[PDB]
Amino acid sequence: KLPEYNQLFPEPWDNFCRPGAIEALDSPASYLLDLY
Amino acid sequence: KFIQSVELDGSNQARKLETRRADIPKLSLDNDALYKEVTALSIVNDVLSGSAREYIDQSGQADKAVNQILGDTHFPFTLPYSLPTQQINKGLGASNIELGTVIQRVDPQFSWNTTQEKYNQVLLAYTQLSSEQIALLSLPDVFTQNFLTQTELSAGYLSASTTEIL
Amino acid sequence: SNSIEAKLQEDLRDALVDYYLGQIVPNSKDFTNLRSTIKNVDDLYDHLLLDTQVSAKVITSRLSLVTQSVQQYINRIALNLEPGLSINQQEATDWEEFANRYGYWAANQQLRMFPEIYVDPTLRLTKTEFFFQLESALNQGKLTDDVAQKAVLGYLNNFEEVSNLEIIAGYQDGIDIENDKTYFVARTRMQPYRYFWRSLDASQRNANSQELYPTAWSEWKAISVPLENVANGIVRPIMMDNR
Amino acid sequence: AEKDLSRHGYIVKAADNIKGPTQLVEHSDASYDVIELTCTNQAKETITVKLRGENIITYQRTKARMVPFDNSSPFSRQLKLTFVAEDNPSLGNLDKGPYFANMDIYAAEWVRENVSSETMVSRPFLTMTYRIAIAKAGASLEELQPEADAFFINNFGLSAEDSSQLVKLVAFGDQTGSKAEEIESLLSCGENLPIVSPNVIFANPIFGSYFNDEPFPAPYHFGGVYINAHQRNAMTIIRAEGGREIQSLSNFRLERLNRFIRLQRWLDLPSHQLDLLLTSVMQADADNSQQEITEPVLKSLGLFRHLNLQYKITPEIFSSWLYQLTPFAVSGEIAFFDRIFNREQLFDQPFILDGGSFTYLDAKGSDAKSVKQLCAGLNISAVTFQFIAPLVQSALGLEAGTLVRSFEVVSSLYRLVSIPQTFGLSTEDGLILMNILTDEMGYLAKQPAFDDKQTQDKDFLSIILKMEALSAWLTKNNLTPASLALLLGVTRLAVVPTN
Amino acid sequence: VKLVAFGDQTGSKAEEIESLLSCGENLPIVSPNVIFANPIFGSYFNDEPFPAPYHFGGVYINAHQRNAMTIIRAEGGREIQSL
Amino acid sequence: VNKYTYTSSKAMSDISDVIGEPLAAWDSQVGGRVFNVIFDGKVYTNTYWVERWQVPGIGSSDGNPHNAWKFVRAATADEINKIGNPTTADVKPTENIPSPILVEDKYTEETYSRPDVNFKEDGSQGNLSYTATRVCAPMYNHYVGDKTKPKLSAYITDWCQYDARLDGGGSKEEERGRGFDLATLMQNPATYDRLIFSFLGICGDIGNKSKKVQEVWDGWNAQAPSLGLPQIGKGHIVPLDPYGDLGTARNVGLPPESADTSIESGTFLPYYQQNRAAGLLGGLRELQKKAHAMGHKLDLAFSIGGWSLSSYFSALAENPDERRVFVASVVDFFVRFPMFSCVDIDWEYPGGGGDEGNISSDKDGENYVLLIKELRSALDSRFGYSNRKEISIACSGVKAKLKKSNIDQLVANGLDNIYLMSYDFFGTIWADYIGHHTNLYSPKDPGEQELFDLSAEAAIDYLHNELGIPMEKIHLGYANYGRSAVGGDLTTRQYTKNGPALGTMENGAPEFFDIVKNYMDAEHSLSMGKNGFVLMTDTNADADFLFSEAKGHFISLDTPRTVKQKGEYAAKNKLGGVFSWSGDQDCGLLANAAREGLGYVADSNQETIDMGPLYNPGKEIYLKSISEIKS
Amino acid sequence: VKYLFNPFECEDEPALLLGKPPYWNSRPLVDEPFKGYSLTQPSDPDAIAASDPIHYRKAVFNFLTKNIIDQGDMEYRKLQPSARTLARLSYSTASSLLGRRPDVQLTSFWQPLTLEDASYKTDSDIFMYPMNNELRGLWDRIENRIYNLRHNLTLDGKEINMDLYDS
Amino acid sequence: LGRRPDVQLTSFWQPLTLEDASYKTDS
């Protein structure tokens, strides 16, 4: 209804991980894993 | 004037302005409300304290000191507070002195040999904690570590494994 | 010294806020409704229209502070955040344009009061085609009297042709002569023949007047088409569908 | 603001040529008091005339027909006078020279002047003055008070008639040689409005009731005092009619003003502090019931000049030395009083000035202690406080163990602290010097005095000047007040027998 | 039981909470140069993350019970292991 | 606001501070000053706003109807001689008129002259005046609003918007319409808090007006296909006079250039929207606009159904699909005219006892439970809480009805308002005995009142207690007319049924302004009966009526006194509100009496006219209850 | 920007009745895709957004908000005092477009593994999409300005006072 | 320009609340 970011993009924030963590889809660890 | 007009346009459900901060239309237009200066904090705490004073009156306890309410209101977490303790803390801070030190020096007897109780109490002072917090921490446990009744006891109960603990 | 007081003032504020959210809102009668949602310090900032987290380092006037809070309230409703209390398009435009800020509001007011102060010959809206040429002469940079004389004499020269313009034809915008605008075309007596168009409104009368506002006359405007191949010194304008 | 005035009255100022109401009474059946006035025209034409005088009250009500009339309240209270021919028809005044006698009235309280020792009596609080003329001819001003025109010539360059021009701001500022910002700085009727301390209680809702609408504090309460002589109808700007104009201009106030602004030029001070200091002096003197320019006043100004120069003494300080501290400010700043005490918040409650007392000797009662501690917040050491307080209590006449939250205590303390401090002497030391000078320590605790039985031990000002001089001499000689007092035998040195 | 309600009522932000739980990256660490009394956690089937928070850093709150509190994957929001 | 100022004085020496006013004989007095008036040697101090008739001796009970004048026997016999004793008090109207009320109407005068009518104020000839509203000036005073005061609302029976005498008609009897013009209120937008233009109809109407219902239903369905809109069927709401609603101007305070007579059943449908409305509804819109201009809020609501239009309600209530069509058309109306905040269901009665042209079933109160639930749900879910509309009912004035109304279940279904039709407790034909029509209280031992001695008290007490309902949802009506009879006998309350009972537009129905025109006057600063009528107040039921002996013309009616008393009672009971029934028939006199009774206060210390002087009570009479007569 | 999107939209606009969704003002931006398109979007941000117009919506939102912050920053860069109030207001509005940052919801859960472990495990989801950086960039930028306003600092967060020293 | 109109310009003022002003500004 009201105009706000999440209202425009309804999405559970819990469906995202914190940036910088190992859990990051682009963590340097993830890069290493891909390489491996 | 503009807002005053707009707020005439229906929707009784809305939390109309004067439902809050009703002092605002009450302020007088004048030279000094214009010219003289004050810390914003002063106003913030003032208006908020006014609200609180009304609420304690709704508790029928306006006879109580508003500050004193904070002396035992345990929730939320930061809520329990003590002005005199703070005053003492900062006082001696400005003197660059610790209360424990003060008491320790105030004892007639020599610090290198004086009663255990004085050592105890001095050390407690060195904690810098308020008596209220002390008491709260001192309260006994409300809950047994576990609780069970015949239903689950008949269904049987398993403790966690234990050999892993040490 | 005073820094001590700052410390205890800040923590007083902190505790008081905690008490408000912790007990007043969840328990107090009037908030039974709003406690559905007002649940954090920012919610307080929104509801109370004032910022609690300012440091003791900041001082202000009572008036200014009130104004700030009012502005916040205005902006929120303008932003269509509170339930109800919608705003008209122009009304909102006025706010977001100038009324949002004292300086521009004052400027608007002052313009209404003393427009002359804002008048500037270089900023005229109504402006003759050749008037552009004239200023395009004078604007050259450093200047001298004789040179200005030359420039103005040129402008005057063109103005001669203006005074010698001869109308050729005209076309009505519609059936109601008494309110529909109309368009006209004219050419120079002097050769080479050059051509211009202009228009006149039939609206813009005063309700009392058997007369029309000066604005009703349009400026005369040049026509760029290489028309000299014309068969017999004849042409017709047409305006339709605003083209 | 400092007293109730809901009940009060007026009495004739006792004069041998006038007879009438000389005492107030809690009730009377008579609609009006009768007064008789004996007077003489300078031709020695002598006559007496009767007149009626009556206390009159007025009030307002809305047409709220549902509620009862609920009338009891403080109310506006006013004095009305009326002559009638029916009481004096015989006098046949056609030929009499028009000039006759003065009339004067005390506005007075009636109370036990000693709440203990009975003395329930009517007692004045304000005084006012009139002149009565009788002229069947309907004579002109040049007949009535021709002296006025001579005055207006010498002091305004104008005919007394020209006052009727002077009423407008243009003519006024012109003839005065003044610009109107000065005038608003004088009138405080625009933005230069008075201001009051939030932390002070007042004796009656004189201005606190619903229908009250006098702007409070009034200029006649503060800043416009001397020029309005406390009359409620204070001078103000008023909207124009062929130019802006002035509220009300009795020639009496006009001549007061004529003096006042000249003095203001000479001293170079803003009006508010001038008026403040002036009133402080004249009201401290019990004699100057009439707000009159007098020798002690002038002397006070001399002292202020000197001390301001030598030590940058703020006139507020000086004023609050010889009188109470002021719970007021002009539009733009915090009140001197409130600044001094609520200088910053250090406790839960701000300090406040109130009725009531506390057992300062020990104040074990938490609130009493709180009060005393906040007062000790006045710079000095707690221990010092106990040296001062008994003397203050004694001088003011309070009960030995108690002190009260009122300006009197405040000002006494403030004197005792600040004055020696101006010479860098400890307030402790001051006691020593005061005894040396007078064999009294608590001397500055007392109120200022101008006793006609003038004696060396009485002039505050001379005494202060002496303190100044001797302090200089002492430091010059590298002495010490304690040492001096001991040597002078003002205090004994501690000794005991020995082996 | 859910993190949102928890952090709300506690007046706390979840980085503090992981700094409390050590169940994420704030994990415990152990000195390589120290021997331990038994392969309590050294055997093949051992799989308790060692050292455990109940061994270190989470001691008082878990009172040494093996079932230590931890974050657990969401179901209509992230949640807590056992409370 | 409205302030007054007064003064007292004493000898200069007198320290006293009581408000003083010397002793005087009790003539009439008035106003806000203190008074200490002697009467039979007792001096009575004034306790309240003095009124002309407030004799202090009686005033020992109530020196004003709010309270006694307290008194003491202070004066000496000498002072009794000095002042004299006023004890032989009497009423006295003013010699003249301080403020005119009545105005000329050439056409009503002609209507009296019209030999087919030959109306005369003595009832000797034509008993129906058909007096147009033109005979009176606007009387509304301006009052300061108060959130705590209950609402003042009015129902306008909008047909009153016509009178052929305006154009030259009036040849026929029915041509002699009311001609009620909104301009009067437009000049005084503060007058009302909430307004309702009365009835609205539905396709299924079986009533006499169904002729028009059908014709406009067909006209709508004639237009709609050309607009691409679906045809309406039963359950769909319909307008009553499209030109009236959307094309009138003259009698609705609108610039006549805005009128459009082309609007009719086959042409109105494009105009049927809030912006296009250039009739009665346009006037209403402009009125709200001017309310905002004044800085006041005017609420607009509309009743669905009516006395005549109740006809189809049982069938509608029974058929759930027609209920659906009803709800849908209602929503569409709200969308076309968002200015309306509220709707009011006016079924004379679901369980019967309304008009006889009504379909009725003893299951319809339950069908109405369904209806309320359905409408509430639909409208709330459609418009959202930010714009939650209000639902109201026109509650029947009789115990037997309200008992059957299942109203507690309607409240469980979120009913908002309960406008009690507390009027016509008596009727000029069906009643056995003359009685009051809108009396607040019942007389002592009124019996069960299925036919007589009814009162608002009798209904509301049951509703609040036996039904437990909060009176904050309840609103009380006052009627802008009297009802009359003929040949009445005041002792037995017998009367000549079936006769020329005096009225304005119809037998037995004298409208209030017409009552002032013909049988009563106030302009002489006092209420009094005229032309053979006398003011009577029944102390049994505490109710006011006019009487005339020559033809036993009994006429109970609402009065300044009764209306003020109603206001007092409403405030006392914190009722949801009060309203003028048929607002078209009060020029503002009793409206002022209502405001004042509820305790609103005027803005200035001046008025259009003071209602005060008119609270003089009618002549005492103890009108025996029917039980007291039979016993 | 208004032509693309207006947050200050008002229901007075009947386009809402003509089905225009709130605030959005571009039909191409609003109307729906139907996958009558490539099964895979190879490499162009624009092409994929042309399949997921939501992506443009996000970009637009970002641009707008940024511009607001830019205004506020200029205001805070102004020398005279009252401009600070303008900056304060601008920043307030901007923040209002975001509510509160989703910290708790973001909180990480982790268990260590060897590369061998991961390699086996990944046989036929340990990571998640993180919050995209520009958002926290915006959040932090405004929070930093707010902090400076908390402490009466320059936009640069430098002390405004001269910081005089003596002994 | 002659002389500036200082005296003629001199301000007259009485304080009020916003509520007061709002009521006062009625027609």
PDB file of C-alpha atoms in Angstrom, chain F residues 286-405:
ATOM      1  CA  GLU F 286     -21.475  23.683  -1.591  1.00  0.00           C
ATOM      2  CA  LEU F 287     -22.728  23.719   1.980  1.00  0.00           C
ATOM      3  CA  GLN F 288     -19.877  21.515   3.117  1.00  0.00           C
ATOM      4  CA  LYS F 289     -17.504  23.744   1.183  1.00  0.00           C
ATOM      5  CA  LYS F 290     -18.783  26.767   3.068  1.00  0.00           C
ATOM      6  CA  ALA F 291     -18.629  24.826   6.317  1.00  0.00           C
ATOM      7  CA  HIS F 292     -14.918  24.405   5.732  1.00  0.00           C
ATOM      8  CA  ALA F 293     -14.777  28.089   4.846  1.00  0.00           C
ATOM      9  CA  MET F 294     -16.353  28.885   8.209  1.00  0.00           C
ATOM     10  CA  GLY F 295     -13.906  26.379   9.642  1.00  0.00           C
ATOM     11  CA  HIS F 296     -16.643  24.013  10.793  1.00  0.00           C
ATOM     12  CA  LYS F 297     -17.397  20.447   9.761  1.00  0.00           C
ATOM     13  CA  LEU F 298     -20.732  19.484   8.239  1.00  0.00           C
ATOM     14  CA  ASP F 299     -21.433  15.759   8.050  1.00  0.00           C
ATOM     15  CA  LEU F 300     -23.546  14.361   5.223  1.00  0.00           C
ATOM     16  CA  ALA F 301     -25.499  11.133   5.521  1.00  0.00           C
ATOM     17  CA  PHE F 302     -28.406   9.556   3.715  1.00  0.00           C
ATOM     18  CA  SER F 303     -31.290   7.347   4.729  1.00  0.00           C
ATOM     19  CA  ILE F 304     -32.227   4.380   2.592  1.00  0.00           C
ATOM     20  CA  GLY F 305     -35.902   3.545   2.627  1.00  0.00           C
ATOM     21  CA  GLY F 306     -38.622   5.477   4.331  1.00  0.00           C
ATOM     22  CA  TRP F 307     -42.168   5.458   5.588  1.00  0.00           C
ATOM     23  CA  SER F 308     -43.632   4.913   2.137  1.00  0.00           C
ATOM     24  CA  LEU F 309     -40.473   3.344   0.716  1.00  0.00           C
ATOM     25  CA  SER F 310     -40.328   0.636   3.407  1.00  0.00           C
ATOM     26  CA  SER F 311     -42.737  -1.357   1.185  1.00  0.00           C
ATOM     27  CA  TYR F 312     -40.364  -3.929  -0.372  1.00  0.00           C
ATOM     28  CA  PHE F 313     -38.005  -4.442   2.573  1.00  0.00           C
ATOM     29  CA  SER F 314     -39.266  -7.873   3.626  1.00  0.00           C
ATOM     30  CA  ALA F 315     -38.759  -9.340   0.160  1.00  0.00           C
ATOM     31  CA  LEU F 316     -35.394  -7.651  -0.196  1.00  0.00           C
ATOM     32  CA  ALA F 317     -34.302  -8.795   3.276  1.00  0.00           C
ATOM     33  CA  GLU F 318     -35.337 -12.338   2.456  1.00  0.00           C
ATOM     34  CA  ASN F 319     -33.638 -12.582  -0.929  1.00  0.00           C
ATOM     35  CA  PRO F 320     -29.859 -12.758  -0.399  1.00  0.00           C
ATOM     36  CA  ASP F 321     -29.136 -11.970  -4.039  1.00  0.00           C
ATOM     37  CA  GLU F 322     -31.290  -8.876  -3.939  1.00  0.00           C
ATOM     38  CA  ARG F 323     -29.436  -8.013  -0.740  1.00  0.00           C
ATOM     39  CA  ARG F 324     -26.272  -8.355  -2.819  1.00  0.00           C
ATOM     40  CA  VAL F 325     -27.627  -6.011  -5.497  1.00  0.00           C
ATOM     41  CA  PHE F 326     -28.555  -3.612  -2.709  1.00  0.00           C
ATOM     42  CA  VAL F 327     -25.065  -3.619  -1.192  1.00  0.00           C
ATOM     43  CA  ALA F 328     -23.484  -3.228  -4.633  1.00  0.00           C
ATOM     44  CA  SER F 329     -25.665  -0.286  -5.617  1.00  0.00           C
ATOM     45  CA  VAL F 330     -24.971   1.286  -2.222  1.00  0.00           C
ATOM     46  CA  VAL F 331     -21.230   0.978  -2.778  1.00  0.00           C
ATOM     47  CA  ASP F 332     -21.641   2.501  -6.225  1.00  0.00           C
ATOM     48  CA  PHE F 333     -23.551   5.415  -4.730  1.00  0.00           C
ATOM     49  CA  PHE F 334     -20.851   6.031  -2.134  1.00  0.00           C
ATOM     50  CA  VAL F 335     -18.258   6.017  -4.897  1.00  0.00           C
ATOM     51  CA  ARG F 336     -20.268   8.447  -6.997  1.00  0.00           C
ATOM     52  CA  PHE F 337     -20.812  10.698  -3.972  1.00  0.00           C
ATOM     53  CA  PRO F 338     -17.932  10.217  -1.520  1.00  0.00           C
ATOM     54  CA  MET F 339     -19.184  13.212   0.478  1.00  0.00           C
ATOM     55  CA  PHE F 340     -21.570  10.892   2.353  1.00  0.00           C
ATOM     56  CA  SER F 341     -20.097   9.419   5.533  1.00  0.00           C
ATOM     57  CA  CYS F 342     -23.129   7.454   6.659  1.00  0.00           C
ATOM     58  CA  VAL F 343     -26.250   5.553   5.685  1.00  0.00           C
ATOM     59  CA  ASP F 344     -29.406   5.109   7.763  1.00  0.00           C
ATOM     60  CA  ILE F 345     -31.772   2.191   7.202  1.00  0.00           C
ATOM     61  CA  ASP F 346     -35.361   3.404   7.577  1.00  0.00           C
ATOM     62  CA  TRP F 347     -37.702   0.431   7.599  1.00  0.00           C
ATOM     63  CA  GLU F 348     -40.788   1.435   9.547  1.00  0.00           C
ATOM     64  CA  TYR F 349     -40.567  -2.021  11.011  1.00  0.00           C
ATOM     65  CA  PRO F 350     -39.254  -5.422   9.895  1.00  0.00           C
ATOM     66  CA  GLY F 351     -41.664  -7.313  12.152  1.00  0.00           C
ATOM     67  CA  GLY F 352     -44.519  -5.238  10.775  1.00  0.00           C
ATOM     68  CA  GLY F 353     -46.530  -2.423  12.274  1.00  0.00           C
ATOM     69  CA  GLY F 354     -45.198   0.181   9.854  1.00  0.00           C
ATOM     70  CA  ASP F 355     -47.173   1.355   6.863  1.00  0.00           C
ATOM     71  CA  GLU F 356     -49.714  -1.164   5.596  1.00  0.00           C
ATOM     72  CA  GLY F 357     -48.219  -1.133   2.089  1.00  0.00           C
ATOM     73  CA  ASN F 358     -45.351  -3.127   3.564  1.00  0.00           C
ATOM     74  CA  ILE F 359     -44.226  -6.648   2.910  1.00  0.00           C
ATOM     75  CA  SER F 360     -43.393  -8.006   6.332  1.00  0.00           C
ATOM     76  CA  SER F 361     -42.274 -11.210   8.008  1.00  0.00           C
ATOM     77  CA  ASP F 362     -41.353 -12.135  11.563  1.00  0.00           C
ATOM     78  CA  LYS F 363     -38.037 -13.344  10.138  1.00  0.00           C
ATOM     79  CA  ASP F 364     -37.054  -9.936   8.809  1.00  0.00           C
ATOM     80  CA  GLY F 365     -35.287  -8.738  11.956  1.00  0.00           C
ATOM     81  CA  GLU F 366     -33.028 -11.738  11.453  1.00  0.00           C
ATOM     82  CA  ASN F 367     -32.709 -11.071   7.754  1.00  0.00           C
ATOM     83  CA  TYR F 368     -31.641  -7.612   8.890  1.00  0.00           C
ATOM     84  CA  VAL F 369     -28.997  -9.206  11.080  1.00  0.00           C
ATOM     85  CA  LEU F 370     -27.734 -10.786   7.880  1.00  0.00           C
ATOM     86  CA  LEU F 371     -28.113  -7.521   5.982  1.00  0.00           C
ATOM     87  CA  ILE F 372     -26.114  -5.560   8.550  1.00  0.00           C
ATOM     88  CA  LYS F 373     -23.382  -8.175   8.681  1.00  0.00           C
ATOM     89  CA  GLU F 374     -23.155  -8.251   4.885  1.00  0.00           C
ATOM     90  CA  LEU F 375     -23.189  -4.495   4.373  1.00  0.00           C
ATOM     91  CA  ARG F 376     -20.723  -3.881   7.199  1.00  0.00           C
ATOM     92  CA  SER F 377     -18.275  -6.456   5.887  1.00  0.00           C
ATOM     93  CA  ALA F 378     -18.537  -5.348   2.265  1.00  0.00           C
ATOM     94  CA  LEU F 379     -18.283  -1.610   2.839  1.00  0.00           C
ATOM     95  CA  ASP F 380     -15.543  -1.861   5.452  1.00  0.00           C
ATOM     96  CA  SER F 381     -13.439  -4.125   3.259  1.00  0.00           C
ATOM     97  CA  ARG F 382     -14.073  -1.872   0.273  1.00  0.00           C
ATOM     98  CA  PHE F 383     -13.353   1.580   1.682  1.00  0.00           C
ATOM     99  CA  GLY F 384     -10.892   0.653   4.413  1.00  0.00           C
ATOM    100  CA  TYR F 385     -10.712   1.841   7.991  1.00  0.00           C
ATOM    101  CA  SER F 386      -9.271   5.216   6.994  1.00  0.00           C
ATOM    102  CA  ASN F 387     -12.686   5.948   5.479  1.00  0.00           C
ATOM    103  CA  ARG F 388     -14.979   3.701   7.517  1.00  0.00           C
ATOM    104  CA  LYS F 389     -18.588   4.633   6.765  1.00  0.00           C
ATOM    105  CA  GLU F 390     -21.287   4.694   9.435  1.00  0.00           C
ATOM    106  CA  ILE F 391     -24.384   2.499   9.620  1.00  0.00           C
ATOM    107  CA  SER F 392     -27.497   3.771  11.378  1.00  0.00           C
ATOM    108  CA  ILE F 393     -31.062   2.626  11.991  1.00  0.00           C
ATOM    109  CA  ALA F 394     -34.285   4.605  12.366  1.00  0.00           C
ATOM    110  CA  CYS F 395     -35.522   2.826  15.481  1.00  0.00           C
ATOM    111  CA  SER F 396     -39.274   2.492  15.953  1.00  0.00           C
ATOM    112  CA  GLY F 397     -40.803   4.410  18.850  1.00  0.00           C
ATOM    113  CA  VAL F 398     -42.570   1.374  20.362  1.00  0.00           C
ATOM    114  CA  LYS F 399     -41.490  -1.315  22.819  1.00  0.00           C
ATOM    115  CA  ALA F 400     -43.215  -4.092  20.873  1.00  0.00           C
ATOM    116  CA  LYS F 401     -41.127  -3.208  17.826  1.00  0.00           C
ATOM    117  CA  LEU F 402     -37.745  -2.578  19.391  1.00  0.00           C
ATOM    118  CA  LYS F 403     -38.130  -5.826  21.334  1.00  0.00           C
ATOM    119  CA  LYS F 404     -38.284  -7.666  18.011  1.00  0.00           C
ATOM    120  CA  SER F 405     -35.470  -5.667  16.467  1.00  0.00           C
TER     121      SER F 405
END
